[PDB]
């Protein structure tokens, strides 16, 4: 027997409602509820969330990012690159009708879709040194335009790159200009990347176009044991030590023929 999706021990789970992990982390405008969330015991995501990447594309190394989250219990968002910091590029025009916010065109909240300015796109050379004591999850992206005219209008420079460097990362990315079928009315694509910036390390960004720059990153402030549970249920005012993807169960009897994936890891199962 079971009830629904409940709370675990004394810590309540993070329940993503129609939003995916990617939409949450990138700041999909349709997921504003998850700005400054508290500690969680485990994370809940639906099988097919409606709000994933408002602007279509891909999240690089997404499965290993999920495995990382299975050992993270709390984030603390911080601003590493203020949007007002961009003086040679336009930072307030990268909005799309694919990313609506209350009817108006918007974009992912934690990253900035930079645009040329004064008919020029000078080379960006920005570095952020993690002076904090915690590990830092940093997110950025690249824009793959649909055609060469779009590349010209947005970034001027026809041949562009993005360079990202840490003590462990040596990444150089070139955009792939190619015509595509439309997704969310968009024929371009946004590809996002992530890395952990260790304390006292520095991430060095360099680009002459197509750069979706970071503004907010996440401090890792607690490293317990979490899971990304796939469930359609909802909170769920209750409490247990063992939880399943289809309901909750208190006390203990080795009877269990429902699901292997269970937070709390209290016996048993077929």
């Amino acid at each position: 027997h079971n009830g629904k999706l409940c709370d675990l021990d004394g810590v309540k789970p993070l329940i993503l409602r129609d939003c995916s992990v990617a939409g949450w982390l990138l700041g999909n405008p349709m997921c504003d509820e998850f700005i400054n969330v508290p500690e969680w015991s485990y994370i809940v995501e639906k099988a097919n969330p409606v709000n994933d990447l408002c602007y279509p594309g891909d999240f690089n190394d997404y499965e290993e990012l999920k495995h990382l989250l299975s050992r993270i219990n709390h984030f603390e968002k911080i601003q590493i690159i203020p949007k007002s910091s961009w003086s040679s590029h336009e930072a307030s025009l990268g909005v799309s009708s694919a990313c609506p916010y209350q009817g108006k065109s918007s974009f992912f909240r934690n990253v900035v879709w930079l645009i040329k300015k004064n008919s020029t796109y000078p080379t960006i050379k920005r570095s952020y040194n993690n002076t904090n004591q915690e590990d830092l999850l940093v997110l950025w992206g690249i824009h793959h335009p649909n055609d060469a005219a779009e590349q010209t209008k947005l970034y001027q420079n026809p041949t562009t790159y993005i360079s990202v460097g840490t003590s462990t990362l040596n990444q150089r990315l070139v955009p792939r200009i190619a015509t595509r079928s439309k997704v969310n009315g968009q024929s371009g694509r946004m590809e996002f990347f992530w890395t952990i910036l260790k304390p006292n390390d520095a991430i060095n960004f360099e680009s002459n176009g197509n750069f979706i720059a970071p503004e907010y990153a996440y401090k890792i402030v607690k490293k317990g044991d979490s899971t990304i549970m796939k469930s359609e249920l909802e909170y769920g005012n209750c409490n247990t030590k063992c939880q399943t993807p289809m309901g909750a169960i208190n006390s203990s009897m080795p009877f269990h023929n429902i699901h292997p994936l269970t937070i709390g890891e209290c016996p048993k199962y077929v």
Partner: antibody, heavy 123, light 108 residues
């Protein structure tokens, strides 16, 4: 709600220059590109170029690189086109127009046009 | 530069007829094409964008079709108010370019 108000007809001597204006109202002036177009009888429509007000981003049709100069005044919501070194072939109706989509979208169609400005170049 | 060719300089129609204006781009423009209507003494008006999307207020008897190089604007059930010039526009490449226009004249 969106209107484009163009300045009036002008008669110019050969070799002179003219500055025509386009006052936009009803929307965020800085979020849409302003197009400029040239229409002559017996000729197809010609694209002159493009300006995104407030950003300094300007595109010119190579055929008009020496003729046209764009500028935009965000406090006045007014876009300007200057035509220099006027010849007989510059006598035409000039339209300003707004792109229907916002600055970074891909559908560059002209949803709102001005009423046009007739330029006559003659001694 | 991409040349947009409207082979039909003129085109006749009775009220209620079905006419189609053709526009051939000299090279691929995908679906980055728009159609406009212009009556004498007036500024152009948007009809179609993205080859087949109807502009907001436009009646649904205006249909656009085609992709790549060959495009068509079809006016079904021609109405007296459709007396106008019609021209295409490609925005796949710089510079933007327009067709030379086709004049629709009503039969009588």
């Amino acid at each position: 709600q969106v209107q484009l108000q163009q300045s009036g007809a002008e008669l110019m001597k050969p070799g002179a220059s003219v500055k025509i204006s386009c006052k936009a109202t009803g929307y965020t002036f800085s979020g849409h590109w302003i197009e400029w177009v040239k229409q002559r009888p017996g000729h197809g429509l010609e694209w002159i170029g493009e300006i995104l007000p407030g950003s300094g981003n300007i595109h010119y049709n190579e055929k008009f690189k020496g003729k046209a100069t764009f500028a935009a005044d965000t406090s006045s919501n007014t876009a300007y086109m200057q035509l220099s070194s006027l010849t007989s072939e510059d006598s035409a109706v000039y339209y300003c127009a707004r792109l229907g989509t916002t600055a970074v979208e891909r559908d560059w169609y002209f949803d709102v046009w001005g009423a046009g400005t007739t330029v006559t170049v003659s001694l | 530069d991409i040349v947009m060719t409207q082979s039909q300089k003129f085109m006749s129609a009775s009220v209620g007829d079905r006419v189609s204006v053709t526009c051939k781009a000299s090279q691929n423009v995908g679906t980055h094409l728009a159609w406009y209507q212009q009556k004498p003494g007036q500024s152009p008006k948007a009809l179609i964008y993205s080859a087949s999307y109807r502009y907001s207020g436009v009646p649904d008897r205006f249909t656009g079709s085609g992709s790549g190089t060959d495009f068509t604007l079809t006016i079904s059930n021609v109405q007296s108010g459709d007396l106008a010039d019609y021209f295409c526009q490609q925005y796949n490449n710089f510079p933007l370019t327009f067709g030379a226009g086709t004049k629709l004249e009503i039969k009588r």
